[PDB]
Design a protein around this ligand. Structure first.
Ligand SMILES: C[S@@+](CC[C@H](N)C(=O)[O-])C[C@H]1O[C@@H](n2cnc3c(N)ncnc32)[C@H](O)[C@@H]1O
Length: 218
């Protein structure tokens, strides 16, 4: 099938992997920039903020990792973003995330201000701010789990293979530098670890994609 239909929140049925990048650090400031600890340390200090929390680069790298993956190219992946200010974003699987941080910031600034980004020539949304909670958008049958260092370690393939034939898997991954992995406790009934080492979010995203790709023969 050279053309798998693009997965969106409107399909409640198709079995897929969903990744939610939670506590994402995406905040605009008119100086419009995305605030970040590399460029805006003095400012963040003056705002009384923990400098280390301003990490939009984490969300940027997780997006590049997830959207480049074989599972995305196979049409079996969705990504949502929950920012630390409570904004929910649905990412269209076909969207092109710029490699440079500068252009990613420009894109996110437009998204946060206009509330969507339309498809260039064709005219449907490539990124859209949507109403909370995430659970109004996920497939009807969908296992929900948080990835955490503090949790028992699983092999992704084992985990994925034990899903029912119609059951999606939604994984919540912290898009932050630090903090408790409690960001999705309202949504999940299970937490799993993927390694005996603390990982970056991009690595944890990558491990989970690889195990799904393997299990699903992608
Ligand atoms: C760099 S960690 C930051 C937050 C983490 N609680 C901490 O304090 O170090 C970013 C995210 O990657 C995931 N992660 C990090 N290590 C992991 C591991 N060993 N197994 C599963 N997920 C992990 C978690 O979802 C985590 O929130």
């Amino acid at each position: 099938p050279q053309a798998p239909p693009v997965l969106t929140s409107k399909d409640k049925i198709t079995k897929r992997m969903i990744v939610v990048l939670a506590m994402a650090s995406l905040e605009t400031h008119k100086i419009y920039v995305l605030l970040n600890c590399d460029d805006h340390q003095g400012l963040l200090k003056k705002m009384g903020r923990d400098i280390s929390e301003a990490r939009p680069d984490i969300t940027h790298q997780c997006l590049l990792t997830l959207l480049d993956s074989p599972i995305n190219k196979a049409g079996k992946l969705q990504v949502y973003i929950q920012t630390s200010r409570g904004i929910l974003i649905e990412v269209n699987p076909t969207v092109r995330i710029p490699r440079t941080f500068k252009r990613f910031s420009g894109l996110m600034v437009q998204l946060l201000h206009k509330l969507s980004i339309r498809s260039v020539n064709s005219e449907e949304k490539l990124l859209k701010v949507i109403k909370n909670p995430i659970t109004d958008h996920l497939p009807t049958k969908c296992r929900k789990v948080t990835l955490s260092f503090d949790a028992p370690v699983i092999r992704v393939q084992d985990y994925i293979e034990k899903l029912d034939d119609d059951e999606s898997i939604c994984v919540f991954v912290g898009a932050m530098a630090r903090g408790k992995d409690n960001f999705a406790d309202e949504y999940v009934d299970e937490k799993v670890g993927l390694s005996n080492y603390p990982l970056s979010a991009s690595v944890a995203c990558s491990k989970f994609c690889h195990g799904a790709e393997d299990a699903w023969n992608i």
